[PDB]
């Protein structure tokens, strides 16, 4: 069937590239055959991750699953400068070509608005939208009243997904949308509550369902230079910590909630 | 003579808007007369902050310092769609008009690339560049080998060119560039590996490292009201006090000094 996952949030630093790289890496290890498309043309975090994996595995001469990384150009930083049309054309090539060869297409998007970004939301089966536990992030999903503090209306990014559905209702056939809270820390109780309320109210208005959070964790960020993740450090030498264990736990919970239980452990 | 501060990092979620809103608020309370310009045309986090302050102070009928918030349009979300030229024209109007009426101009920038963004880097006296303690963020400053540092990177160049553009108007008073680490958490190994590259890069690219902020609810918790710690006297209290407050106003102060604004703490 070939399912397409779009990781999205207009907000910067929501954790989009981090959830995408760990999604890919988990799927790979569930036998699946993944394609990774990175639409952050300049930053190219997912793309950079896997260039580092490539270069690393190579040097150490060990072997591990690699996705099928796909660029729009021979130089995307450069392509970022050409007009929308050329970017879209590039996307075209990369998407079409991945439809062929892969079971999942993982698309990581950038933290603003663009043609290719909008195009990706319209061709997606699942939209995973990680966010920070914070009203600053929440403001791209829904507008809250300063005095009352009631939610008040959907907001910029909500609309972006709402239109990526109307664009899937020309080719007729239901889009899962999951918002999960990422980089969770210790206390934050009062704020985590006020936020959790609006989060729910908004779900009813806009049609997403909340997934399980990840917590702030060095291991989610520490291995980027090598292009590795926790899913690569398994005992299957191997030093396992309580933290590593909590982490692969959360990832697993996450995987299930996205209905990818078929590919965990 | 009317100094201009540009908060910058191409990386999303580096903390730009959070450092800018607290800079403005600290300056205000040091007697200064600030202008706030937000070039994140869609998100408009700093602009949203102060619309909430406006609406909140109004409702509670209390009085507190407000900056001079400046829009490029009557609708910037809309302006985000017009061509570069029109955006730049809008900037023009807003910058020029703030040169007149203010001692500091605080410009918050978005987490990608744009004309107005590049224009702001060329007219800046100080560039405050907050980043996450993370190699993912670091990759927009400098490229590291999968054993170590090889070259400057996308955003380093953006500032390096905003200097060459200040070297037409020959400002003997060069541009100060400060990179500080933001959202610091508890536990060491990653914070060290990073701190090394951070220094090496400084020598190559010409910035100096400033004191970090730590991950703290209070830095994020008051956004809906458009308030900050600097507002939390006995009269203003929408939120119960924590021991955290003192450590917070501490870091802010340390920060302020390091940017040579000791005059306003
Ligand atoms: N659960 C987590 N635990 C620890 N670190 C995290 C976690 N999630 C994200 N990070 C780090 O947080 C920062 C933001 O994460 P990214 O995934 O890079 O965000 P993003 O949404 O891709 O941002 P852009 O720049 O808008 S794409 C990075 O420095 C990551 O290293
Ligand atoms: N020191 C801090 N403590 C706690 N939360 C923080 C801190 N710094 C930033 N945040 C939160 O981190 C997220 C990113 O910070 P922002 O200031 O929004 O980043 P940004 O650089 O404006 O990213 P763009 O503009 O969206 S790219 C927001 O949810 C803030 O509420
Ligand atoms: Mg990214
Ligand atoms: Mg912002």
Residue numbers in the entry:
A (entry chain B): 3 to 175, 178 to 240, 243 to 271
B (entry chain A): 3 to 148, 151 to 191, 193 to 270
What does the paper say about this structure?
Protein gradients play a central role in the spatial organization of cells, but the mechanisms of their formation are incompletely understood. This study analyzes the determinants responsible for establishing bipolar gradients of the ATPase MipZ, a key regulator of division site placement in Caulobacter crescentus. MipZ dynamically interacts with the polar ParB-parS complexes, forming a subcellular gradient with concentration maxima at the tips of the cell and a minimum at the cell center. It inhibits polymerization of the tubulin homolog FtsZ into the so-called Z ring, a structure that forms the basis of the bacterial divison apparatus (Erickson et al., 2010). MipZ belongs to the Mrp/MinD family of P loop ATPases, a heterogeneous group of proteins that act as nucleotide-dependent molecular switches (Leipe et al., 2002).
Similar to other Mrp/MinD-type ATPases (Leonard et al., 2005; Schindelin et al., 1997; Wu et al., 2011), MipZ forms a nucleotide “sandwich,” with the ATP-binding sites constituting the core of the dimer interface. In addition, several residues from one subunit form key hydrogen bonds with the nucleotide associated with the other subunit, suggesting that ATP(γS) binding is critical for dimer formation. Consistent with a direct, adaptor-like role of the nucleotide in dimerization, MipZ undergoes only minor conformational changes upon transition from the apo to the ATP-bound state (rmsd of 0.76 Ǻ). Most structural alterations occur in protein regions that contribute to the dimer interface, especially the P loop, the segment ranging from β sheet 5 to helix 6, and the first residues of helix 8, thereby repositioning the side chains critical for intrasubunit interaction. The MipZ dimer displays a central cleft that extends along the subunit interface down to the nucleotide-binding sites, with its bottom being lined by the phosphates of the two nucleotide moieties. The mouth of this cleft is highly negatively charged (bottom, central right). The remaining surface areas of the MipZ dimer, in particular the side across the opening of the cleft (bottom, right), display a high density of positive charges, thus potentially constituting a DNA-binding surface. The first exchange (K13A) targeted Lys13, which contacts the α- and γ-phosphates of the nucleotide bound to the adjacent subunit and might play a key role in both ATP hydrolysis and ATP-dependent dimerization. An additional substitution (G14V) replaced the highly conserved Gly14 in the P loop with a bulky valine residue, causing a steric clash with the γ-phosphate and the Val14 residue of the adjacent subunit that probably also interferes with dimer formation. The third mutation (K18Q) exchanged Lys18, which constitutes an integral part of the nucleotide-binding site, interacting with the β- and γ-phosphates of the nucleotide associated with the cis subunit.
